[PDB]
Each structure stands twice: as C-alpha cells, then as structure tokens.
Amino acid sequence: GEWEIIDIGPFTQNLGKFAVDEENKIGQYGRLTFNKVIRPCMKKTIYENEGFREIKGYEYQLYVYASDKLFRADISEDYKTRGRKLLRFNGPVPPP
C-alpha cells in the first residue's frame, strides 16, 4: 500500500524486455519487438500486513513501446525469491 515513481534507466529497460519476452510467449498481440520503456514508471510496494514493515513484493506499472506501438504492462516481483510474473499486458493505449 505505497507508491513511488522511479526514473527510467537500465533497471526499467530490463523490466520492459521481460514484459515483451513473456507476452511473446503468450502471443495475444502477435510477435512483438522491444523498443523502450518511457516515463512514467510507477512502483508499488506490497507489505505482508498493512502498517507493518515486512515486504512481500513489488508491482511495477510500465508504459512499454514494442513494434512501435505503446502498451501498458504490469509486472510483479517477489521480495524473497526475486521471481517475476507478467500480470497484464494491454494496448495500444494512448501516450501518458
């Protein structure tokens, strides 16, 4: 239950390439080529219990250009394993 904007850099680029790799496995938008992740990129912190410190994981909301179209992708990341999962990939959406 906490939100921050993170600047884009190699870290968000790597998330955007993960999103496009995962969605290509799914195929619901056909074959996609990764171009780049643009601002803004939101990061949500998910705590085990509201009001306590222990971090369960994170969710990142990205705007990702792929095959020259713009999509919104959400990715989860487990705080202990570092495992990631593509939660949603929708689009084209309009530019923010």
SS3 of residue 14 by DSSP: helix
Q: What is the resolution of this structure in A?
A: 1.8
| C-alpha distances in Å from residue 53, one per residue of 23, 57, 62, 96 | 33, 12, 25, 32
Nearest to 37 by CA among 15, 22, 58: 15
What are phi and psi for residue 57, nearest 5 degrees? 180, -165
Tokens 């202990």 locate to: 80
* 63 CB-side CA count, 13 A: 16
Q: Experimental technique used?
A: X-ray
Gap between the Cα atoms of 69 and 94, Å rounded: 10
Among the listed residues 5, 34, 28, the one whose alpha carbon sits nearest the alpha carbon of residue 90: 28
Residue extents of the structural domains in the chain: 1-96
Architecture of domain 1-96: Roll (3.10)
